Amino acid sequence: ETQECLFFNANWERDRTNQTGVEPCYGRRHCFATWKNISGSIEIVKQGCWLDDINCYDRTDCIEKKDSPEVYFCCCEGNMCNEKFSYFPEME
């Protein structure tokens, strides 16, 4: 049930991609986000489709449940589901 995702690439200039947009998923499809979070300050690394087989923490919402990771990651199902992404560590 995922055909398209929010696209973001902080390395767009060297990678020769758009900086942002809508990615069409081809290649079960998912969307994902990866980000840094230092003392509450969030920096997106990438957003887009995720095509390899994977399991996510929530079906609908993009959520990271690992505890204090250096690079945060989430995946989700549903068109544009990765526009919102949250941190709910298992330790809570």
Ligand X SMILES: *[C@@H]1O[C@H](CO)[C@@H](O)[C@H](O)[C@H]1NC(C)=O
Binding site for ligand X (CB under 6 A): 7, 18, 21-23, 37, 39-40, 42, 72, 86-87
Residue nearer to ligand X on the CB measure, 79 or 86: 86
Q: How far is the CB of 28 from ligand X (least distance, A)?
A: 20
Residue nearer to ligand X on the CB measure, 7 or 50: 7
Q: How far is the CB of 40 from ligand X (least distance, A)?
A: 4
Q: How far is the CB of 88 from ligand X (least distance, A)?
A: 8
Q: Is 86 left (phi over 0), alpha (psi -120 to 50) or beta?
A: beta
Residue nearer to ligand X on the CB measure, 37 or 79: 37
Q: How far is CA 92 from CA 24, 40, 62, 84, in A?
A: 35, 17, 17, 20
List the beta strands (DSSP E) in the chain. 4-9, 20-24, 30-38, 41-50, 62-64, 72-76, 85-87
